[PDB]
Ligand binder design. Structure first.
Ligand SMILES: Cc1cc2nc3c(=O)[nH]c(=O)nc-3n(C[C@H](O)[C@H](O)[C@H](O)COP(=O)(O)O)c2cc1C
Ligand SMILES: Cc1cc2nc3c(=O)[nH]c(=O)nc-3n(C[C@H](O)[C@H](O)[C@H](O)COP(=O)(O)O)c2cc1C
Ligand SMILES: Nc1ncnc2c1ncn2[C@@H]1O[C@H](COP(=O)(O)OP(=O)(O)OP(=O)(O)O)[C@@H](O)[C@H]1O
Ligand SMILES: Nc1ncnc2c1ncn2[C@@H]1O[C@H](COP(=O)(O)OP(=O)(O)OP(=O)(O)O)[C@@H](O)[C@H]1O
Ligand SMILES: [Mg+2]
Ligand SMILES: [Mg+2]
Ligand SMILES: [Mg+2]
Ligand SMILES: [Mg+2]
Lengths: 330, 330
């Protein structure tokens, strides 16, 4: 028996009778799948708890995510291996709190709207990786630091300073946000983790043995930016949006770094400097992507590697061989 | 009539009869101050809503913060100018939810514990500045970007790379966390805002006309680190913890920067590069603090300025005069 707690936002106003409809059909289908649950709503928020044989709970969740009447689904708690039902009588109890006027419910309702509204805001300033840890029972604050090998990804906008100097405030922030959205979408898709924004710079990291995914994410970004420059409206700043990318591999510390006020779950190590140095090198070269030989040698696909005989490393130890990929992008 | 919503964590286990005690005395004192309220608890969490003439609500909050039986107080919502009471009958209704076994309360209780536990974790990965915006009614996600003058503060550990190379993982993270805690405590005290951690680096910012507070925060850090080196145990890594500090002034963009997944409320501008360049200069010099002439000229106190005739700026336009403060720290 799995059990699943999630909250979501109405995709549009819903009458109490439309919510009742969701309640009824949910009851008929849950009663068949052995599922019991409770569906709460409170001023445009859905809350649901759903429990049953995991396999069937997974299918039900999957089509719940497919329903157009709510959006911003966030799984708050996923319990596996539960040995007893919380609400064993209700296939689906629908509790509409907008209409419930009991006086013991008065205070509990106002807190719930306060905490949920607050929590929804904090979500957008949080990395979605923390929520994956939270949902699955682990308190991320209690993870202990560890030394681990990573591919470190650095990307930085070329000559961002001139956007700022010649463009309105709203427009400059639109350019950098568009860039971070393109990069974030592609890195996450390839298994990487965007861990920090540093001005016009994206710092992400991949598992140590995911050099092929790092290289492919980098090539797809460069492809996505080319398509974005060519397709932008007449006179759009997106037409002159270029990026460099540097990749390096090495052993870094991963853990909670910060003060009492505020911590980050992120990495720390020399491989971060190297990837930053490699990314800056791309201003010197005609290639937009450069990466270390340890990245080259950790790739398993037969990439079209090109050896950059001009290495140029400063602040490093042994001379660093720099490679790129030879294609029409570079 | 103000109204105040806060949550806190028990500082120690509390019997239901101790919680009842808090309820009774709260009732007797609230009834006198015209205050009505509701005090909820749920597995080591206090929730309270309190309303009355702001002036008297402020005094009551102040001694609530002084009570040793709860900790981690976070004000969730502060409403000013309220024109009607939510709970006009109860001076203090105490609702113990650990004991309430009603079945309409069953689901609402389990969600509340889920959201609160989740929210408490997210607090520690959030900047406390966001909560000040949230509590006071403003949705920070809806603030629009703006060009504004700031003092930018950069500080960076000297030769952190050798801590990592020669120390255990747990110990390295202890050193950098101790450093971020010292800096954060002093900057916040002087009115500055710590906005980003970048490896072993602290990036904070002050209001544009707070050069004196920026300079004083910097001097106090250097003083605090000296005391921390001299007082550390025999053989402690804290004995070799040194920092540089760079300050620069200029017009920066402030606003929400990031992707759909994750945003930061932070700044963007050339003054950030300059402060980073000035901080790195301190490795060349015997002074641990260096700052631009625009910082020097924005100070109103008669500081003991010293003109550093060796300027050395690269990536800047007009030659930058670099100043420091002449004292036994430098
Ligand atoms: C907040 C919300 C919660 C829902 N919960 C359930 C549920 O628990 N069980 C279920 O079968 N359908 C649930 N649904 C509806 C499903 O997404 C889907 O519409 C339904 O299962 C399809 O059944 P049908 O093909 O017979 O019409 C929910 C919809 C919404 C908006
Ligand atoms: C969660 C918690 C909530 C409290 N709420 C109130 C309150 O609403 N009004 C009040 O007068 N005291 C409240 N107190 C107690 C005050 O902090 C303080 O102990 C009391 O007001 C002092 O009264 P006395 O000096 O007469 O003993 C609360 C204490 C705790 C732990
Ligand atoms: N050392 C630094 N640490 C943190 N943020 C920085 C640093 N230097 C610059 N930034 C931030 O990055 C923004 C862009 O700086 P950057 O050096 O990338 O300039 P650019 O004009 O894009 O040129 P380039 O082609 O060299 O990348 C700056 O406005 C500042 O917000
Ligand atoms: N360009 C960069 N961008 C972001 N983080 C960086 C960058 N360079 C280094 N870091 C992070 O900072 C950590 C320390 O690097 P740093 O350059 O401060 O070295 P250091 O040994 O402390 O020497 P220094 O005396 O020059 O400061 C690195 O391990 C990495 O985590
Ligand atoms: Mg740039
Ligand atoms: Mg940059
Ligand atoms: Mg350093
Ligand atoms: Mg550094």
């Amino acid at each position: 028996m799995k059990r699943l707690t999630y909250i979501s936002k109405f995709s549009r106003p819903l009458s109490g009778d439309e919510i009742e409809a969701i309640g009824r059909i949910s009851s008929q289908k849950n009663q068949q799948a052995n599922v019991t649950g409770v569906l709460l709503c409170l001023d445009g928020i859905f809350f649901q708890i759903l429990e049953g044989e995991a396999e069937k709970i997974d299918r039900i969740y999957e089509r719940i995510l497919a329903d157009e009447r709510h959006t911003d689904i966030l799984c708050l708690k996923s319990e596996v291996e539960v040995q007893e039902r919380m609400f064993p009588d209700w296939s689906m109890q629908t509790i509409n709190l907008d209409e419930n006027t009991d006086f013991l419910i008065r205070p509990i309702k106002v807190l719930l709207q306060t905490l949920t509204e607050s929590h929804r805001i904090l979500e957008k300033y949080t990395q979605p990786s923390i929520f994956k840890i939270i949902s699955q029972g682990t308190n991320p604050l209690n993870i202990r630091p560890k030394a681990v090998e990573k591919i470190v990804f650095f990307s930085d906008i070329v000559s961002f300073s001139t956007f700022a100097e010649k463009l309105p405030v709203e427009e400059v922030v639109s350019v950098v946000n568009s860039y971070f959205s393109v990069c974030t979408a592609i890195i996450t898709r390839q298994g990487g983790e965007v861990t920090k924004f540093i001005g016009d710079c994206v710092m992400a990291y991949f598992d140590g043995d995911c050099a092929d995914q790092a290289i492919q994410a980098s090539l797809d970004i460069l492809m996505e930016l080319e398509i974005l420059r060519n397709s932008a409206p007449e006179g759009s700043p997106l037409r002159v949006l270029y990026s460099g990318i540097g990749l390096a591999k090495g052993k870094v510390i991963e853990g909670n770094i910060g003060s009492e006020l505020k911590r980050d779950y992120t990495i720390l190590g020399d491989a971060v400097n190297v990837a930053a140095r490699l990314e800056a090198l791309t201003r010197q070269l005609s290639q937009a992507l450069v990466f270390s030989s340890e990245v080259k040698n950790s790739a398993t696909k037969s990439w079209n590697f090109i050896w950059l005989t001009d290495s140029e490393l400063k602040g490093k130890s042994e001379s660093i061989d720099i490679y790129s990929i030879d294609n029409e992008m570079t």
